[PDB]
Structure formats: C-alpha cells, structure tokens
Design a protein around this motif. Structure first.
Motif, PDB file in Angstrom:
ATOM      1  N   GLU A  32      -9.296  -5.067  -6.907  1.00  0.00           N
ATOM      2  CA  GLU A  32      -8.134  -4.999  -6.982  1.00  0.00           C
ATOM      3  C   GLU A  32      -7.722  -2.483  -7.834  1.00  0.00           C
ATOM      4  O   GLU A  32      -6.261  -2.597  -6.325  1.00  0.00           O
ATOM      5  CB  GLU A  32      -8.463  -4.871  -8.797  1.00  0.00           C
ATOM      6  N   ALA A  33      -8.769  -2.418  -6.861  1.00  0.00           N
ATOM      7  CA  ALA A  33      -9.051  -1.047  -6.639  1.00  0.00           C
ATOM      8  C   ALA A  33      -7.866  -0.738  -5.464  1.00  0.00           C
ATOM      9  O   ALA A  33      -7.023   0.248  -4.933  1.00  0.00           O
ATOM     10  CB  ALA A  33      -9.700  -0.373  -6.811  1.00  0.00           C
ATOM     11  N   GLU A  85      -6.021  -2.708  -3.979  1.00  0.00           N
ATOM     12  CA  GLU A  85      -4.720  -3.093  -3.468  1.00  0.00           C
ATOM     13  C   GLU A  85      -4.671  -1.645  -3.885  1.00  0.00           C
ATOM     14  O   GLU A  85      -2.958  -1.348  -3.556  1.00  0.00           O
ATOM     15  CB  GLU A  85      -4.487  -4.267  -4.863  1.00  0.00           C
ATOM     16  N   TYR A  86      -4.486  -1.206  -4.888  1.00  0.00           N
ATOM     17  CA  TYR A  86      -3.994   0.071  -5.890  1.00  0.00           C
ATOM     18  C   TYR A  86      -3.504   1.161  -4.557  1.00  0.00           C
ATOM     19  O   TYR A  86      -2.864   2.036  -4.989  1.00  0.00           O
ATOM     20  CB  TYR A  86      -4.557   0.190  -7.163  1.00  0.00           C
ATOM     21  N   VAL A  87      -4.835   1.007  -3.853  1.00  0.00           N
ATOM     22  CA  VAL A  87      -4.543   1.987  -2.643  1.00  0.00           C
ATOM     23  C   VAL A  87      -3.348   2.000  -2.202  1.00  0.00           C
ATOM     24  O   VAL A  87      -2.387   3.523  -1.587  1.00  0.00           O
ATOM     25  CB  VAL A  87      -5.317   2.141  -1.504  1.00  0.00           C
ATOM     26  N   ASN A  88      -2.772   0.460  -1.512  1.00  0.00           N
ATOM     27  CA  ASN A  88      -1.784   0.166  -0.694  1.00  0.00           C
ATOM     28  C   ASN A  88      -0.757   0.665  -1.845  1.00  0.00           C
ATOM     29  O   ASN A  88       0.646   0.630  -1.318  1.00  0.00           O
ATOM     30  CB  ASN A  88      -1.690  -1.561  -0.194  1.00  0.00           C
ATOM     31  N   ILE A  89      -0.113   0.286  -2.872  1.00  0.00           N
ATOM     32  CA  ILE A  89       0.568   0.413  -3.783  1.00  0.00           C
ATOM     33  C   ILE A  89       0.688   1.646  -4.249  1.00  0.00           C
ATOM     34  O   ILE A  89       1.489   2.052  -3.673  1.00  0.00           O
ATOM     35  CB  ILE A  89      -0.194  -0.581  -4.766  1.00  0.00           C
ATOM     36  N   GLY A  90       0.224   2.503  -3.888  1.00  0.00           N
ATOM     37  CA  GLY A  90      -0.196   4.103  -4.312  1.00  0.00           C
ATOM     38  C   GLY A  90       0.696   4.849  -2.655  1.00  0.00           C
ATOM     39  O   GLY A  90       1.666   5.508  -3.420  1.00  0.00           O
ATOM     40  N   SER A  97       2.979   2.735  -1.085  1.00  0.00           N
ATOM     41  CA  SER A  97       3.769   2.756  -1.423  1.00  0.00           C
ATOM     42  C   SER A  97       4.911   3.564  -2.029  1.00  0.00           C
ATOM     43  O   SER A  97       5.961   3.726  -1.797  1.00  0.00           O
ATOM     44  CB  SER A  97       4.564   0.885  -1.768  1.00  0.00           C
ATOM     45  N   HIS A  98       4.492   3.658  -3.185  1.00  0.00           N
ATOM     46  CA  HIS A  98       5.442   4.827  -4.561  1.00  0.00           C
ATOM     47  C   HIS A  98       4.953   5.903  -3.907  1.00  0.00           C
ATOM     48  O   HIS A  98       6.226   6.345  -4.391  1.00  0.00           O
ATOM     49  CB  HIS A  98       4.043   4.040  -5.603  1.00  0.00           C
TER      50      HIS A  98
END
Ligand SMILES: CC[C@@H](C)n1ncn(-c2ccc(N3CCN(c4ccc(OC[C@H]5CO[C@](Cn6cncn6)(c6ccc(Cl)cc6Cl)O5)cc4)CC3)cc2)c1=O
Ligand code: HEM
Length: 531
Positions: A5-6, A8-13, A15-16
């Motif tokens: 999950e985390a 994934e949130y690296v990649n999401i971060g 992009s943001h």
C-alpha cells in the motif's frame, strides 16, 4: 504484512509532486538544493580526513563575497576558528588554504605530480598571452621559457637598461600632462594614472626596444589597454562569455603579437640581431633542449606574457611606494640624503652598480612589497590526493590549494608592528630576497630549496618569479629620480588608501592622489618636444 500500500503511495506522491502549481515547484527548485547543501556540510563536518570547511549559505557561490572583498580578514577569522588549514567554497570550487610558512612549504614545494599551476591559471592567461607559452604548455616547456627570459635579465642587461629607464622617467616628467616639469613647479596626480603609464613606458623601452616603445605614442597604445582588460579575475570564472571586451582582448593579442612578429621577422631578414633587448635575446636563444625551436608566434606570446607580468605588479608597487612616502617626509628626506651621498650630490650619473649602493631605497621597495604583496592568493589545482603532514588531513584531487605569503607578511608574529611602514626593519638586509639554505634548479637557475621564509613576495619552488631583479631595477631607477626631483604629500585629510583586493593585483583604492612639488623649481629637462 502489506507495505505494498505504501509503495503505491510513493508513486502516487511523486505524481502529485509533478502536478504542483508551476510556481510552488520553482520555489522547491530553490529550497531543495539549499537544504541539501546545508545537510552536506554538516555531514562533511564529521569527516576527520578533511580540513574544516567554512560554512556558507548560498550553494556554488560559497564564501566568494567575503573572500573577494577582504581575503586577509577572511583568513584571520578562519584562522582563529580553525587554525592554519581550512577549506572554503568559491564559485563552484573547493579551496584549501594553508596559512603560514608551513603552507608555503606545502604549496610552493609540492611535488610536480601533486599540483598543477597551469590547470589553475591557463584559462585566464592563454587568451591574453597566446598559444603554446607560460601555462599553455607542459611545465617543462615553462621551465625552459623561464630560462630563456632569464638569459636577457642579466647584470649586463640591467647595466644597459638603467639609462634607458632613466631617460623614460625624465621624458615622462617633461612631456606627460600629469607633470610638465618645465612649465609647472607643483601639481596633483593620481598615482593609479601615472604609475601604469610610467611602468609600460619603462618596461617597453628596456625589454622590447625603442620601436615598440615608440608605438605607445600612437593609438596602438589602446590595444594594450584592450588586452589589459582581458586580464581580470572574472576570466577565472568565465573565460569565454561572449562580450565586447573579450573580442577586443583577442583582437589586441593578435594585433600586438603581430607587431612583435613583424619586428622579429624584419630583424632576421636584415641580420639586425644584436643584444639590445628581450626580442634580440629570444631570437638568439629560443630552442628547447629537445631541439624544437619556439616559433615566432610563441616568442611574441612569451613577450606579451613577460610584459604583462611586470606591468601590474610593478605599477601597483610604485603606486604604494609613492603613497606611503607621501605621509613620511622624514623617509623622503633620509632617502634624498642617500641619493646625494651615493651620486655625489647628483654629479654622478645613475648606474646599475650605484643602485646596488642604495640600501635605504632598496629597503623601501622591500618594505612596500612586505605591506603590499601584489598577489594576495596563489593557486594550484590538486592533481593527486595529498596527505597533509602531519595530520589526518587528505586533500583530494579536484580541490585547489591556496597559499598566501602576503597574509604572513602582515603578521606581528613574523614582523613586529606589521601594520607599520618601517624600512629600517630591513637594516643590513636590503636584498630583494635571501636563500637561507641550500639551492635547487628546476630548469631556470638555482633558487632556494626551502620556501619557509615568512617573507616571500616572489613566491618560490618551480613557479618562482624571475622578474625580481628587473622589478628592483625599474623601481629603483624610478624612485631614485622621483626622490631627487620631487617632494610630495597628501591633500588635506587624505592618507594611505586601503587595497582593492578584487582586482588582479592588490592595487590601492582610487583615486589615490598626491601633490608633488619640484625640489628645484628652475630645473629644466632637456630634449626636443612639441608642447
Ligand atoms: C565579482 C563578485 C565579487 C564579490 N568577487 N568574488 C570573488 N572575487 C575575487 C576573488 C579573488 C580574486 N583574485 C585576485 C587575483 N588573483 C590572482 C591574479 C593573478 C595571478 O597570477 C599568477 C600567475 C599568472 O599571472 C602571473 C602574474 N605575475 C607574476 N609575476 C608577474 N605577474 C604571470 C606569470 C607569468 C607571466 Cl609571463 C605573466 C603573468 Cl601575468 O603569475 C594569481 C592570482 C586571484 C584572486 C579577485 C576577485 C570578487 O571580486
Ligand atoms: C615586484 C614585482 C613582482 C612580484 C611581487 C611578483 C610576484 C611573483 C610571484 C609571487 C610569482 C609566483 C607565482 C606563483 O607561484 O603562482 C611570480 C612568478 C613570475 N613572475 Fe613575477 N612578480 C613580479 C614582477 C615580475 C616581473 C618584472 C616579471 C617579468 C620580467 C615577472 C615574471 C614572472 C614570471 C615569468 C613568473 C613565473 C610564473 C610561473 O612560473 O608560473 N614578474 N611573480
């Protein structure tokens, strides 16, 4: 265990982050290397094999401002915080300073493979002087070039240069608007205007000959000015940014080298090669040991280098001498008495030999060079990792080492009352420099092996100056005539100005004006003129 999950949130971060407002991103482009630089220093400050590094807020710039404006104060504060060995960042580079005689030893006597002067200097000097000479050639070529130049700087050469230099000074007193001694008995001059002129005039006549001197009476002189403006510190940082004075510099060196080459070729074609000047000397003595001869272009370039070398150092020095003597009428008086003693009240013509019998005049030059070393910082690029004896300090290749004998010149520890101008501190020690031990030869004559003297105005080691005797000859003649001819002092409320550390040499901050007066108002200087 799901850290997925985390991840994934690296990649999401990221992009943001990519999406952020076009301005906020710019601000991040500033703060991030700002923070990194700070963290880096703190990290660096933990290393024990590195000299302490002076803290700085602005990346790449480093300590450029404070070092640029007042390097001796910078060094003193640094020395208080860290001792004699310390580093600081300068416009993208790491400079490691080693203060004091040990520093002199570490830098000036470094092994040939450890450091490079040409790697430090060539990108300023090569465009100014030209290809294939000084720093645009291997060190062994430099060594031989210095040998060639020294061959024209003999005692016999100086004996012949003294009347030529004297003639130029007298002509300058007669014809320059700054003086005109036959029509004015007193006047005000800016020594930063007169001294560069007197310097190029006397060095032209003696080293290059009458023709080249004569060219300076024409608008050809402006080429020298143009060339001169390519010899500035910014060209250390930015050697080829396209601007007008860069092109004018290049054009100047082509034009001047062209003029020298023209004369060299004429002399060869006419078999008019004598022993008059540095041009003759180099035409006769310009072949490396491997048998390759310098080209006429390289000879020309070497002439430019040599004249440029003596120009700013000597000009700044005679400026400082005049400025210190301007508030010391007691010293002018003592020097005048020595002039009257040695030259039989002026009925002996000045010669090189008689210059050697003027210890107080020579002490004055010596003391001025102590208080005003023309070059406050000399550099080398470190080529191989250097262990600092005897510490755990290692200086990595890619760093630069910085040595500053001029800083030591001003330390009470080595020169009591260092900030006081006192020529008598050199009583019975009036020689330009003194080798206190054994000697060594790098290719241009035997010089001092140790470079631990706290007094080192001409440096030492393989890169040591070879103009010291010419400079004393030129300054000697010049001040001998000044002294016998004029007295001078400051305008009310004026005194010795502070140095300008930002230029190539430590010249005085301008305008630096003095008021002269003739000792003999009715004395006339002979010769034809049209004014
Ligand atoms: C612009 C922003 C500002 C805040 N700033 N930021 C930094 N600085 C700065 C820093 C350092 C310096 N300099 C001053 C000049 N200095 C320097 C100049 C010449 C030099 O020459 C060494 C070699 C090459 O030239 C000669 C000089 N010479 C020797 N004898 C006679 N002249 C040389 C050797 C051989 C020959 Cl043939 C000719 C020449 Cl010119 O020796 C060495 C150091 C380095 C530090 C100046 C400004 C600033 O002003
Ligand atoms: C009093 C004036 C002068 C002073 C203080 C002075 C100072 C110095 C110093 C400190 C060096 C060593 C440079 C270094 O180690 O980085 C040097 C080198 C040199 N100077 Fe001078 N100099 C003077 C005048 C002259 C004159 C008149 C000439 C030419 C006739 C000259 C030509 C040179 C040359 C060719 C070098 C060699 C640089 C090298 O090998 O890398 N200098 N000078």
């Amino acid at each position: 265990s799901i850290v997925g999950e985390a991840l994934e949130y690296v990649n999401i971060g990221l992009s943001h982050f990519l999406a952020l407002p076009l301005a906020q991103r710019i601000s991040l482009i500033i703060i991030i290397p700002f923070i990194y630089n700070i963290v880096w220093q703190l990290l660096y400050s933990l290393r024990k094999d590195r000299p302490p590094l002076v803290f700085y807020w602005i990346p790449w710039v480093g300590s450029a401002v404070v070092y640029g404006m007042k390097p001796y104060e910078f060094f003193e504060e640094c020395q208080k915080k860290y001792g004699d060995i310390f580093s600081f960042v300068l416009l993208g580079r790491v400079m490691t300073v080693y203060l004091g005689p040990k520093g002199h030893e570490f830098v000036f006597n470094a092994k040939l493979a450890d450091v490079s002067a040409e790697a430090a200097y060539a990108h300023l000097t090569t465009p100014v002087f030209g290809k294939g000479v000084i720093y645009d050639c291997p060190n062994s070529r430099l060594m031989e070039q210095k040998k060639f130049v020294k061959g024209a700087l003999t005692k016999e050469a100086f004996k012949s240069y003294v009347p030529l230099i004297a003639e130029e000074v007298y002509k300058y007193f007669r014809d320059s608007k700054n003086f005109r001694l036959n029509e004015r008995t007193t006047g005000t001059i800016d020594v930063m205007v007169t001294q560069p002129e007197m310097t190029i005039f006397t060095a032209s006549r003696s080293l290059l000959g009458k023709e080249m001197r004569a060219k300076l009476d024409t608008d050809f002189a402006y080429l020298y000015s143009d060339l001169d403006k390519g010899f500035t510190p910014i060209n250390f940082v930015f050697p080829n940014l396209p601007l007008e004075h860069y092109r004018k510099r290049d054009h100047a060196q082509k034009a001047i080298s062209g003029t020298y080459m023209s004369l060299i070729k004429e002399r060869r074609k006419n078999n008019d090669i004598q022993d008059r000047d540095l041009i003759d000397s180099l035409m006769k003595n310009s072949t490396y040991k491997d048998g390759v001869k310098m080209t006429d272009q390289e000879i020309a370039n070497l002439l430019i280098g040599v004249l440029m070398g003596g120009q700013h150092t000597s000009a700044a020095t005679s400026a400082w001498i005049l400025l210190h003597l301007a508030e010391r009428p007691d010293v002018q008086q003592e020097l005048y008495e020595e002039q009257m003693r040695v030259l039989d009240g002026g009925k002996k013509e000045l010669t090189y030999d008689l210059l050697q019998e003027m210890p107080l005049l020579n002490q004055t030059i010596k003391e001025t060079l102590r208080m005003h070393h023309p070059l406050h910082s000399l550099f080398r690029k470190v080529m191989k990792d250097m262990h600092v004896p005897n510490t755990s300090y290692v200086i990595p290749a890619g760093y630069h080492v910085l040595v500053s004998p001029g800083y030591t010149h001003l330390r009470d520890e080595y020169f009591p009352n260092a900030h006081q101008f006192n020529i008598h501190r050199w009583n019975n020690d009036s020689a330009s420099s003194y080798s206190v031990g054994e000697e060594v030869d790098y290719g241009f004559g035997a010089i001092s092996k140790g470079v631990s003297s706290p007094y080192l105005p001409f440096g030492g080691g393989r890169h040591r100056c070879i103009g010291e005797h010419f400079a004393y000859c030129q300054l000697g003649v010049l001040m001998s005539i000044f002294i016998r001819t004029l007295k001078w002092h400051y305008p009310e409320g004026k005194t010795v100005p502070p140095p300008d550390f930002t230029s190539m040499v430590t010249l005085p901050t301008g305008p630096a004006k003095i008021i002269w007066e003739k000792r003999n108002p009715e004395q006339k200087i002979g010769g034809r003129h049209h004014h």
